[PDB]
Every structure is written in C-alpha cells, then in structure tokens.
Amino acid sequence: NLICDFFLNTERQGPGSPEVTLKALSFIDNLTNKSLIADLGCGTGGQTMILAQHVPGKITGIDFFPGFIERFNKNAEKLNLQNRVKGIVGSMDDLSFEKDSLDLIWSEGAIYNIGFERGLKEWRNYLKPGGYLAVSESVWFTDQRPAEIHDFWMSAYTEIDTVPNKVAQIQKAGYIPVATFILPENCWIEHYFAPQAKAEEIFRRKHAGSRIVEELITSNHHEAELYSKYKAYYGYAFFICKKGF
C-alpha cells in the first residue's frame, strides 16, 4: 500500500485549486475566532492550509492515512498554524465530535468514501444550526453520457449524479442549498493530473520493480485519458449547505 507514498509527493490527491477553495469560502458568512471547523478527508491538508490562512478559528483535519496527517502537521508547523490547525487520523464514518458543535465542515473530493447522502445525513449531527457544510463531489453535467465514461464511473463511485439530484438531496437532508458551482477544468488538468506527471518519474524509479507502482501509474494515466475525452459530461461541483431549523 504505497498508493499513499505517491500522493505524498503532490500538492493534492484530488481536483481543486486555491481560487476554488476561496470561492467556496466566499459563501460562508458565520466564521469568527471562536468557530470550530473540521475538514474531512483532508489528505495532506493543502486546501486546509489555504483555508486556515483566510478564516479565523480552529480547524481539525481528519484523514484515514497516517502518512497524510504526518505531512499535514509538519506543514502546519512550517506555517506556524500548528496552534489552530491540528491533523488527526480518523474516519468520516466514525467521528467523535460533540453533537451540534461545529460551525463549518469542509471536504473536497473526499465525501465519496462514505457516500454523498450518507454524509449529508450523518455529518449534519455535528453542526450548529445555521452551521455550514462545504463539499466538492463528482457530478454529471448532463442527463446523457457516453457508455465508456458512464461504466467507468459505475465501477469507481456509483453515487455520481447530476447537479439537480445532488441539490434536492441537500434540501431533503435538511439543509438550504446556499451555493453550488461547477469546478473549472484547470482544477483537474492543471492542479491534479499535471503535478502527477513529475511525481511519477521519481516515484516509479525510487520503487523500480514494485508491481503496485507500475499499475498505479496505469490507473492515473487511464483516468487522465477519460477526462481529456469526456470532460464535457462530468467534473466536480462544490456545494455549500447551511443546516436548517
């Protein structure tokens, strides 16, 4: 399981970008120095640092891979945010946060591990009423897509769905769909697939012969191809939800 190692040599493990994280932040108007924030599936904490540098309050990143949490705190350290930004090895399906105690729950390209609707449901219980939930998720841009891309997505994440369905689910889960925007293509190509280029040459050689590596490179190269060919039918959408009642 060196899948981790590879992604340690990258700015982020999923589509995204500073402008996008900030643009989504632009919709949350309840934050102060007393706000408790959580970023679920924070990976190395790249978006978590950009976030921490533009909002007040303490943030808690949570990720399944210890390797990412280690880089998370080390990076937090260099940036001096270690006081108000702590990394923690945990799982989104088994959180220990006091009920209705958070003001903001962040999650970029990580909610698929637990499921869109499931997350909306469960995480809700850790939010102060009027609190926010911001997550980026894979979506279909249309009601019709080719078979290649469709079955590819039915093999990885079956919950991918259209923006309209995602939105109603948010309303159904007891939130107000405050803001919803689709991510620019440069979030995949520029900030995700490209950085993955250099990473590979170095990774592959450091681990020459590792069967897992030779294939990881193949998975990434296949995803990039599907994207460069079907980018018009799918991508990521960011959702800012405000807990009801």
Ligand X SMILES: Nc1ncnc2c1ncn2[C@@H]1O[C@H](CSCC[C@H](N)C(=O)O)[C@@H](O)[C@H]1O
CB 39 within 8 A of CB 61: yes
Nearer to ligand X, 112 or 230 (CB): 112
Q: Which of 108, 48, 35, 106 is nearest to 81 (CA)?
A: 48
- From 62-70, 80-88, 117-125, 196-204, give the range in contact with ligand X by CB under 6 A: 62-70
Amino acid letter, residue 143: D
- From 37-45, 180-188, 196-204, 213-221, give the range in contact with ligand X by CB under 6 A: 37-45
Q: Quick one: tokens of 90?
A: 């945990």
According to CB under 6 A, which one of 16, 87, 131, 235 is a site residue for ligand X?
16
Report whether 13 belongs to an annotated binding site: yes
- CA 197 to the chain's CA centroid: 21
Nearer to ligand X, 91 or 158 (CB): 91
Binding to ligand X (CB under 6 A) within 104-163 occurs at 108-110, 113
CB of 147 to ligand X, least distance (A): 27
C-alpha span between 245 and 239 (Å, rounded): 19
Residue 64 as a binder of ligand X (CB under 6 A): the answer is yes
- Per-residue x/- marks for ligand X, 65-104, CB under 6 A? x--x----------------------xxx-----------
* β-sheet bridge partners, residue 235: 139
Residues with Cβ within 8 Å of residue 141, at least 6 apart in sequence = 162, 163, 182, 232, 233, 234, 235
Q: 218 vs 40, 157, 169, 179, 236, CA distance in Å?
A: 28, 18, 35, 36, 22
CB of 95 to ligand X, least distance (A): 9
Q: Which of 78, 42, 75, 71 is nearest to 59 (CA)?
A: 42
According to CB under 6 A, which one of 35, 41, 135, 187 is a site residue for ligand X?
41
> Which positions lie near ligand X, rule CB under 6 A?
12-14, 16, 41-43, 46-47, 62-65, 68, 91-93, 108-110, 113
Q: Which residues belong to the annotated binding site?
A: 12-13, 63, 91-92, 113
